[PDB]
Amino acid sequence: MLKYIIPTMMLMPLTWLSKNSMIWINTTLHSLLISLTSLLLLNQFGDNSLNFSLTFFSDSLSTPLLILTMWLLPLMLMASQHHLSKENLARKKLFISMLILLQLFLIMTFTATELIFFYIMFEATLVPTLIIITRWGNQTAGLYFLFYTLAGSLPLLVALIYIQNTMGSLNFLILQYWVQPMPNSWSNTFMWLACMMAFMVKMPLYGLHLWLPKAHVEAPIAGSMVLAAILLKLGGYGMMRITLLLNPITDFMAYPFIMLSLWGMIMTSSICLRQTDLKSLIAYSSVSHMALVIVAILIQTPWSYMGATALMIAHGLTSSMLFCLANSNYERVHSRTMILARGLQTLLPLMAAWWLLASLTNLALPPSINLIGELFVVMSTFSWSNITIILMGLNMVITALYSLYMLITTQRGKHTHHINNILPSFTRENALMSLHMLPLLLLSLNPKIILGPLY
Amino acid sequence: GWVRPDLGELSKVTKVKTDRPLPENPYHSRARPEPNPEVEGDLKPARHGSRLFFWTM
Ligand SMILES: CCCCCCCCCCCCCCCCCC(=O)OC[C@H](COP(=O)([O-])OC[C@H](O)COP(=O)([O-])OC[C@H](COC(=O)CCCCCCCCCCCCCCCCC)OC(=O)CCCCCCCCCCCCCCCCC)OC(=O)CCCCCCCCCCCCCCCCC
Ligand SMILES: CCCCCCCCCCCCCCCCCC(=O)OC[C@H](COP(=O)([O-])OC[C@H](O)COP(=O)([O-])OC[C@H](COC(=O)CCCCCCCCCCCCCCCCC)OC(=O)CCCCCCCCCCCCCCCCC)OC(=O)CCCCCCCCCCCCCCCCC
Prior knowledge:
Main location (chain A): mitochondrion
Shape of chain B: elongated
Number of helices of chain B: 0
Bound molecules: cardiolipin
Helix content of chain B: under 10%
Oligomer: part of a larger assembly
Number of helices of chain A: 21
GO molecular function (chain A): NADH dehydrogenase (ubiquinone) activity; ubiquinone binding
Shape of chain A: globular
Largest sheet of chain B: none
Number of domains of chain A: 1
Largest interface: A-B, 9 and 3 residues
InterPro entries (chain A): NADH4_N, NADH_Q_OxRdtase_chainM/4, NADH_UbQ_OxRdtase, ND/Mrp_TM
Radius of gyration of chain B: 31 Å
EC number (chain A): 7.1.1.2
Structural class of chain B: little secondary structure
Number of strands of chain B: 0
Strand order of the largest sheet of chain A: 1-2
Catalytic activity (chain A): a ubiquinone + NADH + 5 H(+)(in) = a ubiquinol + NAD(+) + 4 H(+)(out)
Number of strands of chain A: 2
């Protein structure tokens, strides 16, 4: 993985030594070169993972997450250069450096062979994200960080150090072969919660989800793209690595949290039918889609893991495109109110076509990989219990509705009279929409690369 | 016929030839504990570095 980390770090002199007008073009060009380089991670085999060194390895789970992570950086640089054109040049380079450092943390979070190195990179990703949201966010306690680190990261730290002292190693490749059955006790119960709850908050879990529809609203566009596209999937990646050690206790301890997700994807979806903020609607949709990833990881069948990694990749693409569409409207009406600007197909036909495609992939229109992930998760949960299909299907009613209501509220009807600064679609914005949607459509032609270690 | 000793004579360390044996353990000291073993052998490098969670050197 050293052939990807070193160009990522050479993007730091490539963004600081460049000229005063060249720090978007150079960074976009060379990050697209690294994203083209990222396809060599697809050297995968049906038995053995692509094990590079003692520190780095990349199986078919981390590989689509890595390709999406290295693809997300040029798209964030295309997204965030408009509203930073009035920003200072040194703070502009600071923003690009925070994005490059966050990519640097992510690409060796996903390829950490050893679990405490995964933990350090996992909790190192939060610092550039928090700098981006607090500094280049728009509006104005802080108790969410404290409640996160009490129930989350340090129980995970003590848990991984305990596994280190018991097993002798936190190598995932060794723990594939030295995994022991974890019996019913109270020590193993709090051990299981200490291993799981940090990723539970990072998904988010329903009831622990309220940090996200505010962190998306207080973010810039690149912060929202990297939150909903990659950083929410660190929880799913960590769960798919940590549920190896946590058997067979999960077979009776997944019962509460699955409830919180199986009802949660009912509630938050319905919350998406009662939103006034477009960006909060996309945020609660992200919660409702990650609930199925939580369910599919906790029931731990092969069809569920295939559906969950397909849903992670497809939801990263779809939610990033929806946040970029919300950015394109926020950079015209200067207000995130969804009922404010209406009828925008009468003015911007191609942008309304991108809205149509994004809403079709949001409600899992087949043969998209959204529907492939959604469908495989529904198959595995029907195998889990034959009643959950109702709770699936009711969800698949509501996930249509707010996907099209958001399409009907903003893009249809009579246009707003007192808004006359609706410019035509810039070429950068439609380029951003097409670089979100055309990979998402092309993966429908060959989905087996985004179906995880056990296709 | 006794000569009085001079200045310096009575404070001399003399030698005495006794027929009695030397006391081989005048302190009645019991057997000492055997000491801890010393180090021997050449110093090879550490097997795969520090072995501190993931650091390979
Ligand atoms: C690897 C090689 C691959 C080669 C083949 C390519 C494979 C497909 C790639 C994507 C194709 C569509 C891209 C254009 C649409 C988006 C932009 C747009 O609106 O353009 C309109 C525009 C023409 O309209 P316009 O009047 O000028 O302006 C628009 C209007 O203002 C107002 O707009 P509008 O509302 O009038 O028009 C929008 C209309 C609106 O219509 C709809 O929204 C209805 C669509 C849904 C219902 C019907 C389909 C249901 C599913 C069945 C079909 C799939 C399976 C079929 C197989 C049999 C059954 C299994 O949609 C379309 O016309 C699009 C038709 C194709 C839709 C593809 C699926 C999208 C649906 C949602 C996801 C579904 C799952 C994924 C399926 C993926 C399949 C590959 O078209 C173009 O300019 C096309 C430019 C070139 C596009 C290249 C695309 C490929 C890019 C990849 C590059 C790298 C690989 C090289 C391949 C190069 C191939 C040339
Ligand atoms: C004829 C006689 C002479 C022949 C000459 C032949 C050679 C010619 C080339 C001469 C030049 C050599 C240059 C270094 C050699 C390569 C070292 C390397 O990559 O090790 C792989 C090492 C492990 O990979 P591997 O495949 O197992 O080992 C391959 C070799 O066997 C590597 O050997 P190893 O397995 O024995 O490695 C030992 C161990 C292997 O590592 C481990 O066991 C894992 C522990 C790694 C540290 C984890 C810390 C996590 C928490 C803190 C996070 C820190 C902040 C993150 C970054 C903040 C912003 C900088 O390393 C360490 O414990 C040292 C810590 C990492 C430093 C590596 C070298 C850095 C030099 C440049 C520093 C620039 C900033 C780098 C970013 C700082 C953080 C890495 O990779 C990493 O640890 C990942 C990060 C990448 C390392 C940096 C790349 C080095 C070159 C950078 C040039 C570009 C700079 C751009 C400007 C600054 C941008 C900010």
